Enzyme design. Sequence first.
Site, PDB file in Angstrom:
ATOM      1  N   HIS A  61       5.330  51.121  -5.218  1.00 18.57           N
ATOM      2  CA  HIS A  61       6.359  51.598  -5.951  1.00 18.57           C
ATOM      3  C   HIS A  61       6.969  50.356  -6.603  1.00 18.57           C
ATOM      4  O   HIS A  61       7.387  50.588  -7.776  1.00 18.57           O
ATOM      5  CB  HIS A  61       7.641  51.688  -4.961  1.00 18.57           C
ATOM      6  CG  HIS A  61       7.194  53.230  -4.402  1.00 18.57           C
ATOM      7  ND1 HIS A  61       6.915  53.401  -2.801  1.00 18.57           N
ATOM      8  CD2 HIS A  61       7.251  54.405  -4.809  1.00 18.57           C
ATOM      9  CE1 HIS A  61       6.772  54.677  -2.592  1.00 18.57           C
ATOM     10  NE2 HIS A  61       6.891  55.360  -3.709  1.00 18.57           N
ATOM     11  N   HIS A  91      11.569  41.717  -5.215  1.00 19.80           N
ATOM     12  CA  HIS A  91      10.809  42.557  -6.150  1.00 19.80           C
ATOM     13  C   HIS A  91      11.546  42.910  -7.392  1.00 19.80           C
ATOM     14  O   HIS A  91      12.727  42.370  -7.445  1.00 19.80           O
ATOM     15  CB  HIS A  91      10.584  43.931  -5.403  1.00 19.80           C
ATOM     16  CG  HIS A  91      11.994  44.597  -4.887  1.00 19.80           C
ATOM     17  ND1 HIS A  91      12.537  44.456  -3.770  1.00 19.80           N
ATOM     18  CD2 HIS A  91      12.350  45.444  -5.628  1.00 19.80           C
ATOM     19  CE1 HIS A  91      13.720  45.119  -3.765  1.00 19.80           C
ATOM     20  NE2 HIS A  91      13.657  45.991  -4.977  1.00 19.80           N
ATOM     21  N   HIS A  93      12.482  46.065 -10.537  1.00 19.19           N
ATOM     22  CA  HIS A  93      12.361  47.310 -11.306  1.00 19.19           C
ATOM     23  C   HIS A  93      12.329  46.984 -12.710  1.00 19.19           C
ATOM     24  O   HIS A  93      12.897  46.297 -13.241  1.00 19.19           O
ATOM     25  CB  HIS A  93      13.516  48.137 -10.557  1.00 19.19           C
ATOM     26  CG  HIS A  93      13.943  48.297  -9.050  1.00 19.19           C
ATOM     27  ND1 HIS A  93      13.490  49.357  -8.690  1.00 19.19           N
ATOM     28  CD2 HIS A  93      14.432  47.378  -8.588  1.00 19.19           C
ATOM     29  CE1 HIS A  93      13.746  49.160  -7.130  1.00 19.19           C
ATOM     30  NE2 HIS A  93      14.367  47.815  -7.054  1.00 19.19           N
ATOM     31  N   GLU A 103      18.515  49.157 -12.803  1.00 21.23           N
ATOM     32  CA  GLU A 103      19.058  50.072 -11.745  1.00 21.23           C
ATOM     33  C   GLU A 103      20.570  49.967 -12.036  1.00 21.23           C
ATOM     34  O   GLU A 103      21.108  51.111 -12.759  1.00 21.23           O
ATOM     35  CB  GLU A 103      18.548  49.911 -10.374  1.00 21.23           C
ATOM     36  CG  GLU A 103      17.001  49.911 -10.564  1.00 21.23           C
ATOM     37  CD  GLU A 103      16.808  50.137  -8.764  1.00 21.23           C
ATOM     38  OE1 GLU A 103      17.038  49.517  -7.817  1.00 21.23           O
ATOM     39  OE2 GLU A 103      16.180  51.178  -8.900  1.00 21.23           O
ATOM     40  N   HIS A 116      15.661  42.290  -7.422  1.00 19.63           N
ATOM     41  CA  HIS A 116      16.140  42.192  -6.125  1.00 19.63           C
ATOM     42  C   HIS A 116      15.864  41.195  -5.323  1.00 19.63           C
ATOM     43  O   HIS A 116      14.624  41.077  -4.830  1.00 19.63           O
ATOM     44  CB  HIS A 116      16.107  43.713  -5.857  1.00 19.63           C
ATOM     45  CG  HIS A 116      16.799  44.622  -6.727  1.00 19.63           C
ATOM     46  ND1 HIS A 116      16.906  45.883  -6.589  1.00 19.63           N
ATOM     47  CD2 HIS A 116      17.833  44.529  -7.547  1.00 19.63           C
ATOM     48  CE1 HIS A 116      17.499  46.590  -7.379  1.00 19.63           C
ATOM     49  NE2 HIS A 116      18.143  45.639  -7.869  1.00 19.63           N
ATOM     50  N   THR A 195      18.247  51.190  -2.871  1.00 18.25           N
ATOM     51  CA  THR A 195      18.126  52.230  -4.204  1.00 18.25           C
ATOM     52  C   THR A 195      16.803  52.927  -4.075  1.00 18.25           C
ATOM     53  O   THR A 195      16.490  53.705  -5.139  1.00 18.25           O
ATOM     54  CB  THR A 195      18.035  51.169  -5.384  1.00 18.25           C
ATOM     55  OG1 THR A 195      16.767  50.544  -5.576  1.00 18.25           O
ATOM     56  CG2 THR A 195      19.232  50.512  -5.456  1.00 18.25           C
ATOM     57  N   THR A 196      15.980  52.729  -3.022  1.00 19.72           N
ATOM     58  CA  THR A 196      14.757  53.622  -2.650  1.00 19.72           C
ATOM     59  C   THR A 196      14.844  54.150  -1.353  1.00 19.72           C
ATOM     60  O   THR A 196      15.463  53.577  -0.595  1.00 19.72           O
ATOM     61  CB  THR A 196      13.322  52.556  -2.684  1.00 19.72           C
ATOM     62  OG1 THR A 196      13.555  51.571  -1.646  1.00 19.72           O
ATOM     63  CG2 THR A 196      13.159  51.973  -4.069  1.00 19.72           C
TER      64      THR A 196
HETATM   65  N1  LIG Z   1      15.831  48.284  -4.182  1.00 13.71           N
HETATM   66  S1  LIG Z   1      16.389  47.534  -2.856  1.00 13.71           S
HETATM   67  O1  LIG Z   1      16.793  46.226  -3.065  1.00 13.71           O
HETATM   68  O2  LIG Z   1      17.745  48.311  -2.690  1.00 13.71           O
HETATM   69  C1  LIG Z   1      15.415  47.988  -1.604  1.00 13.71           C
HETATM   70  N2  LIG Z   1      15.080  49.294  -1.386  1.00 13.71           N
HETATM   71  N3  LIG Z   1      14.379  49.075   0.083  1.00 13.71           N
HETATM   72  C2  LIG Z   1      13.933  47.878   0.642  1.00 13.71           C
HETATM   73  N4  LIG Z   1      12.996  47.882   1.714  1.00 13.71           N
HETATM   74  C3  LIG Z   1      12.959  46.634   2.009  1.00 13.71           C
HETATM   75  O3  LIG Z   1      13.178  45.726   1.622  1.00 13.71           O
HETATM   76  C4  LIG Z   1      12.013  46.710   3.322  1.00 13.71           C
HETATM   77  C5  LIG Z   1      11.153  45.336   3.335  1.00 13.71           C
HETATM   78  C6  LIG Z   1      11.726  44.023   4.007  1.00 13.71           C
HETATM   79  C7  LIG Z   1      10.619  43.260   3.836  1.00 13.71           C
HETATM   80  C8  LIG Z   1       9.607  43.609   2.977  1.00 13.71           C
HETATM   81  S2  LIG Z   1       9.669  45.279   2.727  1.00 13.71           S
HETATM   82  S3  LIG Z   1      14.727  46.979  -0.447  1.00 13.71           S
HETATM   83 ZN   LIG Z   2      15.020  46.945  -5.483  1.00 10.82          ZN
END
Ligand SMILES: NS(=O)(=O)c1nnc(NC(=O)Cc2cccs2)s1
Ligand SMILES: [Zn+2]
Length: 257
Positions: A61, A91, A93, A103, A116, A195-196
Amino acid sequence: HWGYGKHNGPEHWHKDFPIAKGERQSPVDIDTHTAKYDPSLKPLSVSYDQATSLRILNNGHAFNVEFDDSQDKAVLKGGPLDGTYRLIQFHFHWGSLDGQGSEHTVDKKKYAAELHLVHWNTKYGDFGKAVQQPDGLAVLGIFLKVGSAKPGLQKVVDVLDSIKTKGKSADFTNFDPRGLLPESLDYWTYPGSLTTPPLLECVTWIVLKEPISVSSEQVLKFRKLNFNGEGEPEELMVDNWRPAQPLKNRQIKASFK
Ligand SMILES: NS(=O)(=O)c1nnc(NC(=O)Cc2cccs2)s1
Ligand SMILES: [Zn+2]
Protein backbone atom coordinates in the site's frame (compact mmCIF):
# COMPACT_ATOMS: atom_id res chain seq x y z
CA HIS A 1 -8.78 -7.09 0.15
CA TRP A 2 -8.74 -3.30 0.46
CA GLY A 3 -6.65 -1.02 -1.72
CA TYR A 4 -6.88 2.01 -3.96
CA GLY A 5 -8.33 0.51 -7.13
CA LYS A 6 -11.77 0.83 -8.72
CA HIS A 7 -13.13 -2.24 -6.97
CA ASN A 8 -11.44 -2.02 -3.57
CA GLY A 9 -10.72 1.70 -3.09
CA PRO A 10 -11.77 4.18 -0.38
CA GLU A 11 -15.48 4.15 -1.35
CA HIS A 12 -15.56 0.42 -0.56
CA TRP A 13 -13.73 0.45 2.77
CA HIS A 14 -16.84 0.95 4.92
CA LYS A 15 -18.07 -2.56 4.11
CA ASP A 16 -15.19 -4.20 6.00
CA PHE A 17 -14.48 -1.21 8.26
CA PRO A 18 -17.77 0.52 9.17
CA ILE A 19 -15.86 3.16 11.17
CA ALA A 20 -15.01 4.57 7.71
CA LYS A 21 -18.21 6.60 8.13
CA GLY A 22 -17.38 7.58 11.72
CA GLU A 23 -17.35 10.87 13.60
CA ARG A 24 -13.61 11.61 13.46
CA GLN A 25 -12.27 10.26 10.18
CA SER A 26 -9.13 11.43 8.38
CA PRO A 27 -7.90 13.04 6.25
CA VAL A 28 -9.86 16.31 6.06
CA ASP A 29 -9.73 19.54 4.10
CA ILE A 30 -8.07 22.27 6.16
CA ASP A 31 -10.03 25.45 5.55
CA THR A 32 -7.41 28.02 6.56
CA HIS A 33 -9.93 30.78 7.10
CA THR A 34 -12.10 28.65 9.43
CA ALA A 35 -9.19 27.20 11.44
CA LYS A 36 -8.87 29.14 14.68
CA TYR A 37 -5.60 30.35 16.15
CA ASP A 38 -5.18 28.89 19.64
CA PRO A 39 -2.54 30.96 21.51
CA SER A 40 -2.55 28.34 24.28
CA LEU A 41 -1.08 25.78 21.86
CA LYS A 42 2.55 25.04 22.73
CA PRO A 43 5.43 24.88 20.28
CA LEU A 44 6.00 21.41 18.86
CA SER A 45 8.95 19.50 20.29
CA VAL A 46 10.55 17.15 17.76
CA SER A 47 13.49 15.27 19.26
CA TYR A 48 14.86 13.01 16.54
CA ASP A 49 18.58 13.27 17.34
CA GLN A 50 18.81 9.71 18.72
CA ALA A 51 16.52 8.14 16.11
CA THR A 52 17.42 4.55 15.20
CA SER A 53 15.97 3.47 11.85
CA LEU A 54 15.87 -0.28 11.21
CA ARG A 55 14.55 -1.11 7.78
CA ILE A 56 12.26 -0.25 4.93
CA LEU A 57 9.31 -2.37 3.78
CA ASN A 58 6.96 -2.33 0.80
CA ASN A 59 3.68 -3.40 2.40
CA GLY A 60 1.57 -3.39 -0.75
CA HIS A 61 0.00 0.00 0.00
CA ALA A 62 3.01 2.23 0.70
CA PHE A 63 6.54 1.82 2.04
CA ASN A 64 7.36 2.14 5.74
CA VAL A 65 10.69 3.14 7.20
CA GLU A 66 10.54 1.58 10.67
CA PHE A 67 12.36 2.61 13.83
CA ASP A 68 13.40 1.07 17.14
CA ASP A 69 10.76 2.34 19.55
CA SER A 70 11.78 0.25 22.57
CA GLN A 71 13.26 3.36 24.23
CA ASP A 72 12.67 7.11 24.13
CA LYS A 73 15.02 7.79 21.20
CA ALA A 74 12.91 9.72 18.69
CA VAL A 75 9.98 11.50 20.34
CA LEU A 76 7.30 14.05 19.67
CA LYS A 77 6.08 16.20 22.57
CA GLY A 78 4.39 19.54 23.16
CA GLY A 79 2.04 21.14 20.70
CA PRO A 80 -1.46 19.86 21.46
CA LEU A 81 -0.03 16.74 23.08
CA ASP A 82 0.11 15.60 26.68
CA GLY A 83 3.00 13.26 27.39
CA THR A 84 5.49 11.64 25.08
CA TYR A 85 4.93 10.02 21.71
CA ARG A 86 7.54 7.68 20.25
CA LEU A 87 8.34 7.52 16.52
CA ILE A 88 7.65 4.05 15.13
CA GLN A 89 7.57 4.54 11.34
CA PHE A 90 7.18 6.98 8.49
CA HIS A 91 5.65 6.57 5.05
CA PHE A 92 4.22 8.64 2.23
CA HIS A 93 1.09 8.88 0.10
CA TRP A 94 1.52 10.16 -3.45
CA GLY A 95 -0.16 10.66 -6.81
CA SER A 96 0.16 9.49 -10.39
CA LEU A 97 0.49 13.20 -11.30
CA ASP A 98 2.06 16.19 -9.49
CA GLY A 99 -1.42 17.73 -9.16
CA GLN A 100 -2.61 15.14 -6.63
CA GLY A 101 -1.32 12.74 -4.01
CA SER A 102 -1.81 14.33 -0.62
CA GLU A 103 -4.49 13.11 1.77
CA HIS A 104 -5.05 16.34 3.67
CA THR A 105 -5.84 19.32 1.50
CA VAL A 106 -5.42 23.04 2.22
CA ASP A 107 -8.35 25.16 1.00
CA LYS A 108 -9.07 22.22 -1.32
CA LYS A 109 -5.51 22.34 -2.72
CA LYS A 110 -3.88 18.94 -3.23
CA TYR A 111 -0.13 18.52 -2.87
CA ALA A 112 1.98 16.02 -4.85
CA ALA A 113 2.47 13.82 -1.78
CA GLU A 114 2.21 13.74 1.98
CA LEU A 115 4.66 12.38 4.55
CA HIS A 116 3.32 10.76 7.73
CA LEU A 117 5.56 10.36 10.77
CA VAL A 118 3.68 7.99 13.07
CA HIS A 119 4.13 8.18 16.87
CA TRP A 120 2.47 6.32 19.77
CA ASN A 121 1.68 7.51 23.30
CA THR A 122 4.17 5.89 25.69
CA LYS A 123 1.63 5.68 28.52
CA TYR A 124 0.00 2.81 26.59
CA GLY A 125 3.14 0.67 26.50
CA ASP A 126 3.12 -0.30 22.83
CA PHE A 127 1.65 0.61 19.46
CA GLY A 128 -0.95 -2.16 19.49
CA LYS A 129 -2.44 -0.89 22.74
CA ALA A 130 -2.14 2.75 21.70
CA VAL A 131 -4.33 2.41 18.59
CA GLN A 132 -7.22 1.30 20.81
CA GLN A 133 -7.16 4.68 22.60
CA PRO A 134 -8.60 8.04 21.52
CA ASP A 135 -5.27 9.74 22.32
CA GLY A 136 -3.09 6.81 21.32
CA LEU A 137 -1.25 8.16 18.28
CA ALA A 138 0.19 11.40 17.01
CA VAL A 139 0.85 11.60 13.29
CA LEU A 140 2.97 14.46 12.00
CA GLY A 141 1.87 15.23 8.46
CA ILE A 142 4.10 17.12 6.04
CA PHE A 143 3.13 18.15 2.49
CA LEU A 144 5.46 17.58 -0.46
CA LYS A 145 5.48 19.85 -3.51
CA VAL A 146 7.55 19.29 -6.64
CA GLY A 147 10.43 21.74 -7.06
CA SER A 148 13.98 21.60 -5.76
CA ALA A 149 15.27 18.24 -4.54
CA LYS A 150 15.20 17.34 -0.85
CA PRO A 151 18.71 16.05 -0.11
CA GLY A 152 17.54 14.33 3.07
CA LEU A 153 15.06 12.24 1.06
CA GLN A 154 17.61 10.85 -1.38
CA LYS A 155 18.72 7.85 0.69
CA VAL A 156 15.08 6.74 0.75
CA VAL A 157 14.70 7.22 -3.01
CA ASP A 158 17.84 5.20 -3.76
CA VAL A 159 16.77 2.10 -1.80
CA LEU A 160 13.37 1.82 -3.53
CA ASP A 161 14.73 -0.40 -6.33
CA SER A 162 15.43 -3.02 -3.67
CA ILE A 163 11.81 -3.02 -2.43
CA LYS A 164 9.87 -2.73 -5.69
CA THR A 165 7.16 -5.27 -4.83
CA LYS A 166 4.83 -6.10 -1.93
CA GLY A 167 6.56 -7.98 0.89
CA LYS A 168 10.10 -6.88 0.04
CA SER A 169 12.17 -5.34 2.84
CA ALA A 170 15.71 -3.99 3.09
CA ASP A 171 18.00 -2.97 5.93
CA PHE A 172 17.74 0.79 6.41
CA THR A 173 19.92 1.86 9.30
CA ASN A 174 21.21 5.28 10.35
CA PHE A 175 18.63 7.31 8.47
CA ASP A 176 18.01 10.72 10.02
CA PRO A 177 14.36 11.80 9.72
CA ARG A 178 15.32 15.38 10.65
CA GLY A 179 16.33 15.75 7.00
CA LEU A 180 12.66 15.51 5.99
CA LEU A 181 11.41 18.48 8.06
CA PRO A 182 10.67 21.96 6.70
CA GLU A 183 12.08 25.11 8.38
CA SER A 184 8.95 26.06 10.30
CA LEU A 185 7.02 23.89 12.75
CA ASP A 186 3.83 25.99 12.52
CA TYR A 187 0.96 23.51 12.39
CA TRP A 188 -2.76 22.81 12.30
CA THR A 189 -4.17 20.19 14.63
CA TYR A 190 -7.41 18.21 14.93
CA PRO A 191 -8.60 14.84 16.30
CA GLY A 192 -8.87 12.15 13.65
CA SER A 193 -8.09 8.62 12.52
CA LEU A 194 -5.75 6.34 10.64
CA THR A 195 -6.26 7.03 6.94
CA THR A 196 -6.00 3.35 5.99
CA PRO A 197 -7.86 0.36 7.42
CA PRO A 198 -8.58 -0.32 10.23
CA LEU A 199 -9.29 3.47 10.20
CA LEU A 200 -9.16 3.61 14.01
CA GLU A 201 -10.09 6.92 15.63
CA CYS A 202 -6.95 7.17 17.72
CA VAL A 203 -4.92 9.94 16.08
CA THR A 204 -4.07 13.48 17.10
CA TRP A 205 -3.20 14.95 13.70
CA ILE A 206 -0.52 17.61 13.51
CA VAL A 207 -0.17 18.92 9.96
CA LEU A 208 2.66 21.32 9.18
CA LYS A 209 1.88 24.55 7.33
CA GLU A 210 5.14 24.60 5.37
CA PRO A 211 5.57 21.96 2.67
CA ILE A 212 8.92 20.47 1.77
CA SER A 213 10.03 20.52 -1.86
CA VAL A 214 11.18 17.35 -3.59
CA SER A 215 12.38 17.01 -7.18
CA SER A 216 10.45 15.63 -10.11
CA GLU A 217 13.01 12.79 -10.27
CA GLN A 218 12.48 11.97 -6.60
CA VAL A 219 8.69 11.60 -6.83
CA LEU A 220 9.05 9.78 -10.17
CA LYS A 221 10.93 7.08 -8.29
CA PHE A 222 8.05 6.66 -5.81
CA ARG A 223 5.80 5.99 -8.82
CA LYS A 224 7.95 3.09 -10.05
CA LEU A 225 7.06 1.02 -7.00
CA ASN A 226 4.50 -1.80 -7.29
CA PHE A 227 1.33 -2.59 -5.29
CA ASN A 228 1.70 -6.24 -6.32
CA GLY A 229 4.08 -8.96 -5.19
CA GLU A 230 6.87 -10.32 -7.39
CA GLY A 231 5.47 -12.66 -10.04
CA GLU A 232 2.06 -10.99 -9.95
CA PRO A 233 0.75 -8.67 -12.69
CA GLU A 234 2.45 -5.29 -12.36
CA GLU A 235 0.35 -2.48 -10.90
CA LEU A 236 2.16 0.80 -10.25
CA MET A 237 1.95 2.06 -6.67
CA VAL A 238 0.43 5.49 -7.36
CA ASP A 239 -2.59 7.35 -5.96
CA ASN A 240 -2.41 5.60 -2.62
CA TRP A 241 -4.27 8.44 -0.89
CA ARG A 242 -7.66 8.59 0.80
CA PRO A 243 -9.66 11.70 -0.11
CA ALA A 244 -10.90 14.28 2.39
CA GLN A 245 -13.63 13.08 4.77
CA PRO A 246 -16.42 15.09 6.41
CA LEU A 247 -15.18 17.30 9.26
CA LYS A 248 -18.43 16.81 11.20
CA ASN A 249 -18.24 18.01 14.82
CA ARG A 250 -14.59 19.08 14.85
CA GLN A 251 -12.58 22.30 14.99
CA ILE A 252 -9.18 22.54 13.34
CA LYS A 253 -6.86 24.65 15.52
CA ALA A 254 -3.87 26.63 14.25
CA SER A 255 -0.63 27.23 16.16
CA PHE A 256 -0.01 30.44 14.24
CA LYS A 257 -1.68 33.64 13.06
N1 LIG B 1 -1.80 6.88 6.99
S1 LIG B 1 -1.73 6.85 8.62
O1 LIG B 1 -0.55 7.50 9.14
O2 LIG B 1 -2.91 7.44 9.22
C1 LIG B 1 -1.62 5.19 9.13
N2 LIG B 1 -2.54 4.26 8.82
N3 LIG B 1 -2.27 3.03 9.30
C2 LIG B 1 -1.15 2.93 10.01
N4 LIG B 1 -0.73 1.70 10.59
C3 LIG B 1 0.51 1.63 11.27
O3 LIG B 1 1.23 2.61 11.41
C4 LIG B 1 0.93 0.35 11.85
C5 LIG B 1 2.40 0.23 11.93
C6 LIG B 1 3.25 0.60 12.98
C7 LIG B 1 4.58 0.33 12.70
C8 LIG B 1 4.84 -0.23 11.46
S2 LIG B 1 3.34 -0.42 10.66
S3 LIG B 1 -0.37 4.47 10.07
ZN1 LIG C 1 -0.31 7.68 6.06
